From TrEMBL, chains A, B:
Positions that bind UTP: 18-19, 21-24, 121, 124
Annotated Mg(2+) 2 binding sites: 23, 79
Highest taxon above the source species: Bacteria
Residues reported to bind Mg(2+) 1: 23
Section of the entire sequence shown: 1 to 170 of 870
This protein's name: Metallophosphoesterase
Binding-site residues, ATP 1: 18-19, 21-24, 121, 124
Length: 171, 171
């Protein structure tokens, strides 16, 4: 197993393209209420599925909910693409403000893997250019993550490594 | 500052080319007794600085000294180049055997920075080809370190980042 150590009070930031398996991973490894997804926050603003017209509001709500959970000392996982630096920075700042370790878990999978899983999704799907872009952004992000403020940086380089993951929480 | 978290009982493996500043870094951050260097272990086998028959035995001696330290629950830093997988493999196994976290600290510095320090060294120097080879090996090593068994992988990408390091011994 790939043992990934996280402190009992952490902000776990999932980083990966649409289709990289973040929400699948989150559900496998964490309790439902520990996981806050951008999709869930969008659904609070709109009964339409994946409504793109409320994106700004959805992410504001995500930040707010995350900050309130950390305030109460509760480990939180952020389930969003997080491939842009502008997306990760507020999470880092929130974590620092609540004296919580931000942790990066990166889904460094080949583009083709996400493109392939995308075409077979039942919930929703995106165009191929979106996953190409997401994958480029993710790859560009990897080097600078520690410097951005992530205390622990876990890069998963293949589906097998993702599968093998086991989290060890330390209090 | 770049805060790098290490458990109280860790095997810290320095990874970097000759000239990358490993020994200097080890001296700044750790106690002299905590640090076991390949140069020291060679010295135990020969006063002759240019002996290559000694290398195997000196690595055996280093592994054993590290083993006995970790068995005694004493944090140990391996000050050797460690740019080859065959050199890291026994270190990881040793850490695992004494239920210690192996930590990788990688001096991901440009070849030219290492070559220049080496030129300016007054204690002992290596040939330029050695540093060219180390740097390529260090670079090829980065991606696989987590998979090799390192529990925390810390990549230092510039002299400034190296200089900014603060170790935090919490877990
Ligand atoms: N390890 C896996 N092996 C095979 N299929 C997988 C794996 N993980 C996820 N999938 C499938 C489930 C889905 O149909 C599809 C996308 O997974 P999902 O977890 O929704 O990605 P995601 O949450 O990263 O995308 P988005 O960012 O669009 O929410 O891939
Ligand atoms: N951060 C730094 N800034 C400027 N000069 C440095 C720095 N670190 C080391 N040096 C200089 C001092 C030494 O004369 C020279 C080599 O450093 P040293 O710590 O001996 O490297 P090393 O331990 O990685 O080499 P080797 O693997 O050959 O033992 O470089
Ligand atoms: Mg998802
Ligand atoms: Mg040295
Ligand atoms: Na130093």
């Amino acid at each position: 197993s790939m043992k990934l150590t996280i402190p009992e009070l952490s902000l776990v930031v999932l980083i990966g393209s649409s289709g990289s398996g973040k929400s699948t991973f989150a559900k496998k490894h964490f309790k439902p209420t520990e996981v806050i997804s951008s999709d869930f926050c969008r659904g609070l603003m709109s009964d339409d599925e994946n409504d793109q017209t409320v994106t700004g509001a959805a992410f504001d709500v995500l930040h707010y909910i995350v900050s309130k959970r950390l305030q109460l000392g509760k480990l939180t996982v952020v389930d969003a693409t997080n491939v842009q630096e502008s997306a990760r920075k507020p999470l880092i700042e929130i974590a620092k403000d609540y004296h919580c370790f931000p942790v990066a878990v990166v889904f460094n999978l080949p583009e083709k893997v996400c493109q392939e899983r995308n075409k077979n999704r039942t919930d929703r799907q995106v165009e191929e250019y979106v996953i190409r872009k997401h994958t480029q952004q993710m790859k560009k992000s990897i080097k600078g993550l520690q410097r951005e403020g992530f205390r622990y940086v876990y890069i998963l380089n293949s589906p097998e490594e993702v599968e093998e993951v086991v989290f060890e929480r330390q209090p």
